[PDB]
């Protein structure tokens, strides 16, 4: 009788929903947010998950883990792991050919497998659901990228189990997104669906072919290292020069400062999605010197123009691999927190014969939404 949940275990954010009495409910965390950072932090006295973990990153960088989704199901020697390792502030060690994240926790050295860090994020999402329903949740459906291999899917499933969940099914994120928009219920002929999924660290384009209720992955393309964080960094480099020009000081060397700026830029970016301008106010950014400035949407767009325009290439590549003209796509689906960027929406719109965009479901909640539906269906 207990309802099962749908969990979108994202690269940088996670989301949980539950299908109740004919509708899907996206559950808010303790801070009232419908998305939770896929972050786990370890201190001298506690282990933080979600917002609390990401909030103290600037003061505890070596022990605040993220991007566990990039390591999960992979080998220590995998070139992807060795490359990614160079960009993380935490240590990744080898354990019988398997990578482990090593940190300082409660006064000592501890190492964790990717699926262990991920199981911690899953527990948080499980408890959020449990507080809402009022009872224990034991069944779930978890999404993963369509390109994930058997090994990556297995480790993710192991994560759900370690989090005390029976994973009813591991499904593809673009499939989950299709389900959210109800493209899995028509049974009349076949239709072409393109999924434009731009998150905080990754960009995925998926072309699916739904023939009378059956899903078929036609093509996939994108960039696993292109996402919202890259837009934040364009803003960061922008303000570093401005601070450098107004107070004559290069802050690019003070780690804590760069981090506090990146966090401010991230929030400024979001404001630029609904307003033409945004203010950036950081107290004692560098050497006690404050930093209050402003920036227009257009300026922001110019700073990321190349990045935004690059998103159309994976789109055209997918169309090619799937041997379809852009006009042959029946359903254009935009998901991911970054598709909220007016500019990103316009580039896609102009590209796709200036067609109308579907604004019926929340882009950063879409994956969890479809997951919840499938979970309920699987639960009878
Ligand atoms: N209103 C917004 N405007 C611009 N970017 C946003 C907005 N809301 C969220 N984002 C961005 O979307 C990204 C988070 O995407 P999301 O799909 O939720 O997670 P994930 O990275 O785990 O896939 C972040 O880079 C975030 O800054
Ligand atoms: Ca996402
Ligand atoms: Cl919470």
Query: The domain that contains 242 carries what CATH number?
Result: 3.90.640.10
- Which residues are within 8 A (CB) of 304 and not within 5 positions of it... i.e. 6 or more apart? 230, 231, 234, 343
Query: Are 181 and 195 in contact, with CB atoms under 8 Å apart?
Result: no
- Pure H helices in the chain: 51-55, 68-71, 79-85, 114-133, 150-162, 173-180, 228-246, 255-271, 297-310, 312-321, 342-351, 366-378
Nearest ligand to the CA atom of 14: 1
Find the helix packing angle between 297-310 and 228-246, rounded to 10°: 140
Q: Other C-beta atoms within 10 Å of 364: how many?
A: 21
Residues 13 and 57 in one domain: yes
Write out the two tokens for 87.
Answer: 């960009």
Say which DSSP state 214 is in. B
State residue 364 phi and psi, 5-degree precision. -95, 5
Say which DSSP state 336 is in. S
Method in brief: X-ray
Report which protein residue has its CA nearest ligand 1's atom 10: 337
Enter the resolution in angstroms: 2.3
The domain containing residue 113 runs over which residues? Answer: 66-120
Residues 32 and 99 in one domain: no
Numbered residues of the known binding site for ATP: 10-13, 69, 200-202, 266-273, 337-340
Query: Are 191 and 183 in contact, with CB atoms under 8 Å apart?
Result: yes
Residues 328 and 296 in one domain: no
Domain count across the chain: 4
User: Helix (H, G, I), strand (E, B), or coil: what is residue 199?
Assistant: coil
Say which DSSP state 274 is in. T
CATH code, domain carrying 346: 3.30.420.40
Query: Are 377 and 335 in contact, with CB atoms under 8 Å apart?
Result: no
Please give the angle made by the CA atoms of 87, 93 and 98, to the nearest 5 degrees: 110
Say which DSSP state 57 is in. G
Residues 247 and 293 in one domain: yes
Residues 235 and 298 in one domain: yes
Residues 318 and 173 in one domain: no
* CB-ligand 1 contact for 200 (6 Å cutoff): yes
- Which residues are within 8 A (CB) of 312 and not within 5 positions of it... i.e. 6 or more apart? 347, 348, 351
Write out the two tokens for 125.
Answer: 């999402």
Report which protein residue has its CA nearest ligand 1's atom 12: 337
d(CA 378, CA 6): 11
Residues 24 and 135 in one domain: yes
Q: Provide Rg for the chain, Cα atoms.
A: 21
Which H or E run contains 296? strand 289-296
Write out the two tokens for 307.
Answer: 């990045």
Write out the two tokens for 155.
Answer: 């480790």
Say which DSSP state 150 is in. H
Residues 125 and 147 in one domain: yes
């Amino acid at each position: 009788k207990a309802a099962a949940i749908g969990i979108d275990l994202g690269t940088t954010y996670s989301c949980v929903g539950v299908f109740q009495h004919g509708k899907v409910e996206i559950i808010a965390n303790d801070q009232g947010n419908r998305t939770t950072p896929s972050y786990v932090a370890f201190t001298d006295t506690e282990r933080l998950i979600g917002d609390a973990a990401k909030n103290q990153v600037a003061l505890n960088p070596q022990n605040t883990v993220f991007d566990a989704k990039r390591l999960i199901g992979r080998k220590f020697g995998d070139p992807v792991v060795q490359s990614d390792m160079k960009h993380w502030p935490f240590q990744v060690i080898n354990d019988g050919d398997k990578p482990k994240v090593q940190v300082s926790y409660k006064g000592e050295t501890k190492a964790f497998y990717p699926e262990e860090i991920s199981s911690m994020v899953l527990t948080k999402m499980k408890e959020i659901a449990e507080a809402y329903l009022g009872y224990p949740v034991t069944n779930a459906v978890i999404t993963v990228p369509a390109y994930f291999n058997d090994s990556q899917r297995q480790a993710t499933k192991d994560a759900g189990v370690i989090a005390g969940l029976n994973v009813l099914r591991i499904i593809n994120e673009p499939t989950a997104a299709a389900i959210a928009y109800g493209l899995d219920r028509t049974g009349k002929g076949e239709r072409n669906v393109l999924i434009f999924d731009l998150g905080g660290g990754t960009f995925d384009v998926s072309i699916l072919t739904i023939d009378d209720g059956i899903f078929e992955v036609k093509a996939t393309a994108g960039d696993t290292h292109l996402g919202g964080e890259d837009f934040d960094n364009r803003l960061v480099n922008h303000f570093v020069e401005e601070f450098k020009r107004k107070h004559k000081k290069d802050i690019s060397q003070n780690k804590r400062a760069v981090r506090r700026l990146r966090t401010a830029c991230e929030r400024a970016k979001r404001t630029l999605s609904s307003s033409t301008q945004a203010s950036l106010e950081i107290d004692s950014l560098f050497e006690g010197i404050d930093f209050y400035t402003s920036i227009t949407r257009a300026r922001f767009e110019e700073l990321c123009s190349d990045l935004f325009r690059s998103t159309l290439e994976p789109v055209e590549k997918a169309l090619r691999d799937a041997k379809l003209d852009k006009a042959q796509i029946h359903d254009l689906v935009l998901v991911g927190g970054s598709t909220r960027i007016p500019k990103v929406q316009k580039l896609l719109q102009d590209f796709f014969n200036g067609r109308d965009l579907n604004k019926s479901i929340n882009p950063d909640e879409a994956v969890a939404y479809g997951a919840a539906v499938q979970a309920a269906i699987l639960m009878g």
